[PDB]
């Protein structure tokens, strides 16, 4: 209810289930990873932007991030 | 996110795939992940939880299969035990028997054991038999509605399907 | 049970390679000041010229090789197939 | 799934067991650990295309999955090692059945990603046999 | 009583500081 | 939620042995009880500690998707069987229990032999299934082993009915 | 160590049935209490007051052997045990091992999805 | 603050940052132009041979020694009552010597000084000839000093405090290896760090890192299991 | 969110609206609100008193008394002289307790922590990212507590 | 349920009457106290609620601050030697020299 | 806390107090001069003179708090925008009302 309202976690598991993890992973797990992901994210336009001109780039090729 | 004990054994770790070399003691959560955590911890590590889910069933359910097998073959030894008198019942059964009888023995069968030892690749063979099985009764639609469960649009159309599966063998010159 | 399952990794030993020279590039960092001392001894003997034949550097080569191959021969035979430790001891 | 047709059989579709080698297991196992994240890529991508685009009227409904080619030729990458082409499209012979397989099942009849992975996995194992 | 170990002589035996022989029993242990 | 759950138990059980119990020496039992049942409980409580910090989470399929090392496997093992055979009891550890059962009221006896230590059957079945152990589990089933043949010697030695069911 | 065949006068000083403060008394059957017998009290009460007078008085107490034997039972049953597990290995039966052929599914257990 | 730095040390790691090594010869070199005093002090190498067996038994049962001296003098001797009569004794020749304290701290740590002498003596060899060669270093660790803990305590305490002995020897050993053994609170290396070899290109150990990276994305319960919201 | 106008009588209300539960500021952010005066000295601090710190005052003189009452209902065996005289020193605190809070106002004003009447050129551009806190207040008390939502 | 006053109503009606049980005097005495705790109670929950929410959201603006602080820690702390090693020189010279822009 | 910037710029010598009102004028021109350039990376070289007030004015521990919160700035703008993170928490916070049931038997790793 109310007290539990503000995690889709019950309340004893957001206590005791982490252990020195960020709230921000624990609640906004989206926003963490994008902002982890800020310099792959602009790889991966740089790598899109050369894809459009005909210049595979091999290195960055695995930065393919959906989330 | 999966993290990690740190450990305490002084001992290098060389990677030809990165070409990196580290210590055992100097390991945060991703390579204790990769290097010491990377090991199997089932029969078929290369399926998805739903299909080794299925492996894991299907395994089991041929354990009992072969159970199935040796109990079967003691029911017919017991029916020749009474349909045939002890004068000529040991050459009817050493006949071809008592060689089944061996066939599905304690090494071949878990019985009553607790766990049948068998190797990945033995639990493969049972699982890929017990999917050869469910083939040959599922072209037929045998398994609804002891071994499967459908609906009633999926039972007519099974039933067509077999119905032209049935006619096309039946069409079919013999060998 | 662990035996009963298949193998995660393959070793350069698994694959029937031998991973010597790795090993002695990677155990060479262990042993810099033998190495050192090899150096500053073939400097000198090439300094000098028809110098007396008991006068070799292959002492303070046996002192390095024995200090690289202290670690790469060990390690090595720790991946061999015949090598376990044993049941109890 | 590991079952192999008789080619010469008394019946339509009688099948034989096999098992796989234990190099490829292990192959199609570290792989599916290192490349597990662009599989479920590829069903959100699915699953949110098909909120934005999915409608006719949409004006990115003539794109279709395309935003996911990207997810699958990764996976495909990452899968096949970087040894076997940088697209899903340039392929093996032996796995473009299997691909094509893959294809249908995963944006033409979009079952669930269980048997996406089997059909990819299959591609995968398809090269590996080829190229062991 | 005491013996350098670095002359290529293990524990006093000074007929061998031609040839690598700790390896694998005092350098190392195979 | 399991663990909690399972850690629960023990309240109860001691307010129903220290307040309903008429013997004067069911005091005593309910202490033991209690100091026994919680070492066995600190047990799992460091093996399930262990199991959350190591892979942090609550589930036990992110559990079948990840693998705990040779040395952290064999401390779990340890601790869960060494706990829930604290409060099974096994052998050396069911002292606790004779003193309960010939102390507790009859009704907290039923249900203490009955269906307690079954919870931690329970509890070490799924903590143990969901955990891949590769050491040898010989000493584990000598303990048991050693437990049911140190109980089944002390039978004829029973005067007390109600020791006599606590050793069965 | 043995039971007196003598007669002897019935004890003065015995451990008795003692019950908690305001405690509801048992009164099934009418309510009828009889009073006890002294020496069958005191033998209720023997046993869970006995103790050992002196340090390492449990072994000689009885049979040395037996009290030997009966300490070393643990270690005799592991040590069958790892006989056992020697037996099975080299004929590849059921060794004592947590088979971990489930992968963690649990035996029966429902495995469905939320929608 | 460190124990046991000299067993604990990557000594891959230590020559490839170019540290110095512990294990490096720690020895001297005479020429033969040295005087005969130059040539006889440069013997003292010798007591800095670590795989001088002597030299380490020594040494060692002379840090048993100074251990029990002190505790002889901080918690031992102050424990135990010396009769009233022994001690005017004492100070009798306290007064009547030029030096009689020394005397008397020799006589009374003289039981401690020798049996700290002897427990590690003999526990320096017992771990260096019995135990060296162990598999399982924790559980070699603690049997070994399980058993000889039990042993000291019935010889040196009293034989009826053997079980509590093997107790504190089992905890003392899981010590040992927590901490002198093992390198806790005494890294000398960062967490995570590694040296590369193979002359990869940056190129390649970049892609490399991509593809650790997409890897460590399935470490997260909420990226492995699609519980993600669209952001 | 709005807050009470400075200079008048209810800007004191203004010192319990904080768009953010930190107690300070870092060392290079900058104040809500532009700088008067960075450098205070006590005598600028008390030429910039206004209408808002003598309502600060006000306050503490109106809710001083119920607190001094609330204080002496403890009080036993004590004559009327002492009594009044310990309802007076109490008293006298909590208007000094109410000076205290007026003159921190005006130097929150002086240093831009607290509304001023001034607006800086160019506001800090701030993503609530995180926002845990914004369909709470909306539909609650607590939006006049928090300044930005 | 979903209304933290309601909650705290609730709250301060049942510990109303638990202390009227603890004290042994009958409950219905004080009445007045009834409505009083559930007020009291009630403000008291929607802020601590309210708080909470908040702190929890300045919390995660700490951690973002934080991470900064942790790697460079994690670069401050590397072993002497360590700073111009292959694993950490790309680090280090990015936080050294790239972000030296004051 | 030696690793802490923030709690070494707190630290400052006896007697040195900060002109904020100055600093801040300084730090106002200088990030409008940047921001009109509007790059990557911050180039200070390309607003000299702002630059130099913007030195004079302002102490380091300052700056480098500055400096920080911009490089943090940059990224949150390329990162996010108003209206999408005002969606992501709603949506966030309605799901919060809800479970989260775990994925069994699933299809990845
Ligand atoms: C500077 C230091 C501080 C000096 C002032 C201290 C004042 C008191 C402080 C408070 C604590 C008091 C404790 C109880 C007590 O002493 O009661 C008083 C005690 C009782 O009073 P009383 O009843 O009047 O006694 C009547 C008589 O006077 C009774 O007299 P006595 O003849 O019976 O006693 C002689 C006295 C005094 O003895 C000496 O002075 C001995 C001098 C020679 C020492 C040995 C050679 C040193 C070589 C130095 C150079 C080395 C170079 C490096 C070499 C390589 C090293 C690896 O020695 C002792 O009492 C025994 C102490 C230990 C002796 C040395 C042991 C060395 C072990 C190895 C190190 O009175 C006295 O002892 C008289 C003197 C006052 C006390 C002095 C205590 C000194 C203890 C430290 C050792 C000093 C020498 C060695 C220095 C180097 C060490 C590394
Ligand atoms: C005694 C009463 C027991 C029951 C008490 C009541 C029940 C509740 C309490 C808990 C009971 C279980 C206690 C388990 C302790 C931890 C064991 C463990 O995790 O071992 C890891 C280990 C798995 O790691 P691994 O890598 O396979 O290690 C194999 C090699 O050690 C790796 O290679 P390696 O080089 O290490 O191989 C050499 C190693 C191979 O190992 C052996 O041969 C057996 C080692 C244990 C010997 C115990 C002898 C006791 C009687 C004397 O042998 C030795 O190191 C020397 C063996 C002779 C030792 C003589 C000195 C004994 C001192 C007194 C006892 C101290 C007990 C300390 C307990 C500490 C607990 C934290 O698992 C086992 O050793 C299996 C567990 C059973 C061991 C033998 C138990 C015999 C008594 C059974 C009584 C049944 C009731
Ligand atoms: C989730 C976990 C975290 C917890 C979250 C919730 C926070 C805790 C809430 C607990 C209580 C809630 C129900 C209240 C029931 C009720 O109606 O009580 C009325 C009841 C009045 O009884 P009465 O018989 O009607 O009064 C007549 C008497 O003659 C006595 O009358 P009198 O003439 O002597 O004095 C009258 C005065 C009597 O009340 C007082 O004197 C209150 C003193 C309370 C203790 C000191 C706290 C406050 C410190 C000073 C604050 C100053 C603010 C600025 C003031 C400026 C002007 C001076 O005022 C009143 O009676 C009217 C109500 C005034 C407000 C009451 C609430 C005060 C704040 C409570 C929370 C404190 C902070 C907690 C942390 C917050 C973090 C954000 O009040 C009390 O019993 C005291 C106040 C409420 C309880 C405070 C102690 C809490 C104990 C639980 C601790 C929980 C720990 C959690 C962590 C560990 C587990 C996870
Ligand atoms: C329980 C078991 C406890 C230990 C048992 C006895 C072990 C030593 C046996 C005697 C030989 C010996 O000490 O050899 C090692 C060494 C041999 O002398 P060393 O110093 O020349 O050793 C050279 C290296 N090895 C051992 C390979 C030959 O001697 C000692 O350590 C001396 C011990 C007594 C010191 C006083
Ligand atoms: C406006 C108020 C509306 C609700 C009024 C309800 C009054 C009756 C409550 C039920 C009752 O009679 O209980 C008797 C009992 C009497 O308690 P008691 O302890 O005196 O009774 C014990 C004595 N015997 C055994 C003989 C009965 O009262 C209660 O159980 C609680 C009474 C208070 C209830 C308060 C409800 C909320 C009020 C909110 C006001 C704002
Ligand atoms: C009391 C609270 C619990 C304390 C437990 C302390 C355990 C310390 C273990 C230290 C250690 O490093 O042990 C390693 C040792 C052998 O592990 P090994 O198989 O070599 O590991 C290689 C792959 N990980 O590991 C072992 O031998 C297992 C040790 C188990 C100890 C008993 C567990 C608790 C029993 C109560
Ligand atoms: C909280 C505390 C945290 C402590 C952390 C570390 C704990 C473990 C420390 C172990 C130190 C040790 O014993 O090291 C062994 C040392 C020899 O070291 P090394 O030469 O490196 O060993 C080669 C490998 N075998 O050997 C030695 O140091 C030898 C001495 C060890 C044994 C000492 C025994 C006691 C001595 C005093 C006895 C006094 C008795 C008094 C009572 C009787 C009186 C009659
Ligand atoms: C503190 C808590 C300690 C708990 C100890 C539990 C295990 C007890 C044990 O293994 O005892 C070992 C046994 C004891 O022998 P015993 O002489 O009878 O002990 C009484 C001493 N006054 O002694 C032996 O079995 C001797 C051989 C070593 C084991
Ligand atoms: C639709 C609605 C319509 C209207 C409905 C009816 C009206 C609703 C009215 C709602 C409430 C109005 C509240 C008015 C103002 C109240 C002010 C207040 O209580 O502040 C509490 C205080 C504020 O916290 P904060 O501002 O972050 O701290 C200073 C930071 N510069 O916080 C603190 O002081 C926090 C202290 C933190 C450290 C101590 C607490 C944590 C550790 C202890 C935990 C608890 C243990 C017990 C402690 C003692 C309890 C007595
Ligand atoms: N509790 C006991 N302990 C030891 N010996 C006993 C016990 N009860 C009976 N006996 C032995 O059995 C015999 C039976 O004696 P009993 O018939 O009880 O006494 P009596 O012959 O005087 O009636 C006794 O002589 C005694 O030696």
Redo the contacts with the bound molecule.
């Keep these: 209810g109310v007290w539990s309202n503000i995690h889709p976690t019950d309340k004893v598991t957001l206590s005791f289930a982490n252990i020195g993890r960020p709230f921000r992973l624990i609640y906004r797990p989206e926003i963490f990873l994008r902002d982890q992901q800020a310099k792959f994210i602009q790889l991966e336009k740089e790598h899109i932007e050369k894809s459009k001109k005909g210049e595979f780039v091999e290195t960055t090729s695995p930065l393919v991030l959906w989330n | 996110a999966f993290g990690g004990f740190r450990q305490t054994d002084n001992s290098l770790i060389i990677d030809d795939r990165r070409k990196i070399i580290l210590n055992t003691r100097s390991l945060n959560d991703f390579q204790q992940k990769i290097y010491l955590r990377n090991f199997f911890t089932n029969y078929r590590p290369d399926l998805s939880s739903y299909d080794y889910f299925a492996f894991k069933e299907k395994l089991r359910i041929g354990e009992l299969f072969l159970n199935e097998y040796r109990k079967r073959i003691n029911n017919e030894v017991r029916r020749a035990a009474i349909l045939t008198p002890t004068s000529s019942l040991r050459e009817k059964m050493n006949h071809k028997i008592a060689d089944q009888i061996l066939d599905l023995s304690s090494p071949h069968v878990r019985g009553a054991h607790f766990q049948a030892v068998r190797s990945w690749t033995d639990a493969s063979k049972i699982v890929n038999y017990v999917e050869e099985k469910q083939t040959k009764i599922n072209k037929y639609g045998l398994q609804f509605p002891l071994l499967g469960n459908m609906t009633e649009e999926q039972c007519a159309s099974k039933e067509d399907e077999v119905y032209q599966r049935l006619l096309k063998e039946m069409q079919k010159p013999p060998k | 049970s662990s035996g009963d399952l298949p193998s995660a990794t393959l070793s350069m030993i698994q694959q029937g390679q031998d991973p010597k020279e790795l090993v002695l590039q990677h155990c060479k960092p262990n042993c810099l000041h033998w190495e050192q001392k090899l150096k500053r001894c073939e400097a000198k003997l090439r300094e000098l010229v028809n110098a007396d034949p008991e006068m070799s550097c292959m002492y303070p080569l046996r002192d390095w090789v024995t200090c690289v191959e202290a670690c790469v021969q060990p390690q090595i035979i720790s991946q061999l197939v015949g090598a376990q ?2 049941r ?2 | 799934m590991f079952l192999n047709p008789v080619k010469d059989s008394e019946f339509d579709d009688e099948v034989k067991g096999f098992v796989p080698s234990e190099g490829e297991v292990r192959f199609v196992a570290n792989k599916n650990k290192e490349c597990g994240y662009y599989l479920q890529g590829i069903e959100q991508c699915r699953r949110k295309m098909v909120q934005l685009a999915g409608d006719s009227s949409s004006q990115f409904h003539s794109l279709g999955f395309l935003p996911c080619k990207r997810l699958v030729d990764a996976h495909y990458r990452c899968m096949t090692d970087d040894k076997f082409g940088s697209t899903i499209e340039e392929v093996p012979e032996i796995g473009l059945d299997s691909a094509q397989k893959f294809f249908d099942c995963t944006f033409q009849q979009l079952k669930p990603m269980q048997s996406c992975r089997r059909f990819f996995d299959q591609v995968v194992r398809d090269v590996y046999r080829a190229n062991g | 009583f005491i013996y350098r170990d670095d002359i290529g002589a293990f524990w006093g035996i000074k007929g061998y500081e031609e040839l690598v022989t700790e390896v694998g029993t005092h350098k190392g242990h195979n | 939620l399991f663990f909690m759950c399972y850690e629960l138990l023990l309240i109860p059980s001691f307010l129903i042995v220290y307040f309903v119990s008429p013997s004067r020496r069911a005091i005593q039992a309910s202490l033991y009880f209690v100091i026994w049942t919680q070492l066995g409980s600190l047990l799992v409580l460091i093996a399930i500690s262990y199991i959350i910090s190591i892979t942090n989470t609550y589930e036990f399929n992110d559990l079948k998707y990840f693998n705990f090392t ?1 040395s952290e496997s ?1 401390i779990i093992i ?1 601790l869960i069987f ?1 706990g829930f055979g604290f409060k099974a009891p ?4 069911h002292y606790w229990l004779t003193k309960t059962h010939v102390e507790a009221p009859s009704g907290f006896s039923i249900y203490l032999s009955g269906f307690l230590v079954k919870t931690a059957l329970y509890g070490f079945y799924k903590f143990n299934t969901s955990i891949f152990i590769d ?2 589990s ?2 584990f089933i ?2 048991c082993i ?1 437990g049911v043949v140190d109980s089944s010697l002390k039978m004829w030695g029973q005067t007390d009915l109600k020791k006599l069911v606590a050793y069965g | 160590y043995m039971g007196n065949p003598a007669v002897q006068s019935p004890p003065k000083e015995f451990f008795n049935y003692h019950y908690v403060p305001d405690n509801y008394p048992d009164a099934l059957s009418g309510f009828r209490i009889a009073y006890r017998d002294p020496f069958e009290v005191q033998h209720v009460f023997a046993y869970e007051n006995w103790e050992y007078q002196y340090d390492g008085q449990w072994w000689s107490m009885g049979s040395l052997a037996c009290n030997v034997l009966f300490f070393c039972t ?2 005799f ?2 040590l069958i045990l790892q006989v056992e597990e020697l037996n099975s290995e080299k004929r590849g039966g059921t060794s004592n091992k947590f088979y971990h052929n489930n992968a963690g599914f649990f035996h029966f257990q429902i495995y469905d999805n939320k929608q | 603050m460190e124990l046991n730095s000299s067993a604990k040390e990557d000594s891959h790691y230590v020559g490839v940052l170019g540290y110095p090594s512990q294990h490096d010869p720690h020895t001297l070199h005479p020429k033969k132009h040295d005087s005969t005093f130059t040539k006889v002090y440069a013997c003292r190498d010798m007591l800095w041979d670590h795989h001088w067996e002597v030299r380490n038994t020594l040494y060692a049962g002379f840090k048993g020694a100074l251990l029990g001296v002190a505790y002889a003098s901080g918690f031992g001797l102050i424990s135990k009552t010396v009769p009233s009569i022994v001690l005017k004794k004492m100070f009798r020749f306290v007064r009547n010597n030029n030096f009689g304290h020394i005397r008397i701290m020799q006589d009374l740590l003289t039981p401690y000084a020798l049996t700290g002498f002897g427990l590690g003596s003999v526990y320096y060899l017992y771990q260096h000839n019995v ?1 060296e ?4 270093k924790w ?2 660790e ?3 000093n ?2 000889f803990f ?1 042993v000291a305590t019935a010889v040196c305490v009293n034989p009826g405090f053997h079980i509590y002995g ?1 107790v504190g020897g ?1 905890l003392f050993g ?1 010590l040992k290896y927590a901490f002198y053994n093992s390198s806790f609170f005494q890294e000398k290396e960062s967490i995570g760090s590694y040296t590369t070899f193979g002359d990869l290109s940056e190129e390649e150990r970049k892609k490399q890192e991509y593809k650790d990276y997409i890897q460590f994305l399935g470490n997260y319960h909420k990226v492995r299991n699609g519980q993600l919201v669209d952001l | 969110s709005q807050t009470f106008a400075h200079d008048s009588f209810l800007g004191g209300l203004n010192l319990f609206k904080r768009r953010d539960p930190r107690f300070v500021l870092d060392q290079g952010e900058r104040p809500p609100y532009p700088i008067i005066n960075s450098n205070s000295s006590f005598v600028d601090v008390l030429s910039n008193f206004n209408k808002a710190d003598f309502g600060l005052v006000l306050f503490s003189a109106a809710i001083g008394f119920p607190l001094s009452r609330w204080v002496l209902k403890g009080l036993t065996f004590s004559s009327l002289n002492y009594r009044r005289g310990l309802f007076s020193s109490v008293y006298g605190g909590v208007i000094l307790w109410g000076l205290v809070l007026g003159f921190n106002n005006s130097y929150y004003r002086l240093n831009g922590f607290v509304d001023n009447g001034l607006v800086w050129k160019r506001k800090e551009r701030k993503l609530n990212k995180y926002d845990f806190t914004s369909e709470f207040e909306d539909n609650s008390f607590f939006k006049k507590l928090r300044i930005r939502d | 349920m979903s209304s933290m006053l309601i909650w705290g109503a609730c709250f301060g009606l049942f510990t109303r009457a638990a202390a009227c049980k603890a004290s042994m005097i009958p409950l219905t005495t004080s009445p007045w106290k009834y409505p009083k705790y559930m007020i009291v109670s009630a403000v008291t929950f929607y802020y601590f609620d309210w708080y909470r929410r908040m702190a929890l959201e300045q919390l995660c603006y700490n951690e973002e601050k934080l991470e900064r602080y942790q790697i460079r820690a994690k670069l401050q702390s590397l072993k002497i030697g360590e700073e111009l090693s292959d694993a950490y020189r790309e680090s280090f010279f990015e936080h050294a020299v790239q972000k030296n822009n004051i | 806390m030696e690793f802490s910037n923030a709690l070494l710029s707190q630290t400052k010598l006896p007697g040195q107090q900060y002109d904020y009102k100055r600093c801040f004028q300084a730090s106002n021109t200088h990030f409008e001069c940047l921001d009109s350039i509007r790059d990557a990376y911050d180039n200070h070289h390309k607003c000299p003179q702002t630059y130099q007030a913007w030195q004079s004015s302002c102490d380091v521990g300052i700056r480098r708090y500055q400096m920080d919160n911009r490089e943090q700035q940059k990224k949150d703008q390329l990162l996010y925008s108003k209206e999408q993170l005002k969606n992501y928490n709603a949506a966030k916070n309605k799901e919060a009302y809800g479970i989260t049931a775990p994925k069994n038997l699933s299809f990845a790793f």
């Design positions: 430790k044993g109890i001891w | 040779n064999t340890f060494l096994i052998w050396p550890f050491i040898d010989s000493i000598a303990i050693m | 643990p270690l049953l592991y | 135990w060669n162990r598999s399982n559980l070699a603690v049997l070994s399980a058993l039990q093997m089992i899981t």
